[PDB]
Design a protein around this ligand. Structure first.
Ligand SMILES: [Cl-]
Ligand SMILES: [Cl-]
Ligand SMILES: [Cl-]
Ligand SMILES: [Cl-]
Ligand code: NA
Length: 129
């Protein structure tokens, strides 16, 4: 599923992501924009052989099981496929664990490089929330 901007903001809010760990909703929307272009089926292979999955490009090295990342963990206790669903519940639940892991949203390198410090409220501008 390819979400609209405000559609995704609303789904993230429903699932309690807004201001989770102090990160306003526009931070999450901006991160999704640059990680997946709002496409739940986004995947991207890393050089190390891990894969990133879904709207927030969550990595199999630590967070989900795909059966093909040797030595990896599955800290969200989910198949990485669950991260590609139209329903974002698994992605949001796992994102909450990632953002609580110590480095905040810096776990998402695209958020650090393209969202951090910017006018992230623009991402929820105009949205009926
Ligand atoms: Cl689609
Ligand atoms: Cl915001
Ligand atoms: Cl594995
Ligand atoms: Cl933080
Ligand atoms: Na894994």
């Amino acid at each position: 599923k390819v979400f609209g901007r405000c559609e995704l903001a609303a789904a993230m809010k429903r699932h309690g992501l807004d201001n989770y760990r102090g990160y306003s909703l526009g931070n999450w929307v901006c991160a999704a924009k640059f990680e997946s272009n709002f496409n739940t089926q986004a995947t991207n292979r890393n050089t190390d052989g891990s894969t990133d999955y879904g709207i927030l490009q969550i990595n199999s090295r630590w967070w989900c099981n795909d059966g093909r990342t040797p030595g990896s963990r599955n800290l969200c206790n989910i198949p990485c496929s669950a991260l590609l669903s139209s329903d974002i519940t698994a992605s949001v639940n796992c994102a909450k664990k990632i953002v609580s892991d110590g480095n905040g949203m810096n776990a998402w390198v695209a958020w650090r490089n393209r969202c951090k410090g910017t006018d992230v409220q623009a991402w929820i501008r105009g949205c009926r929330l």
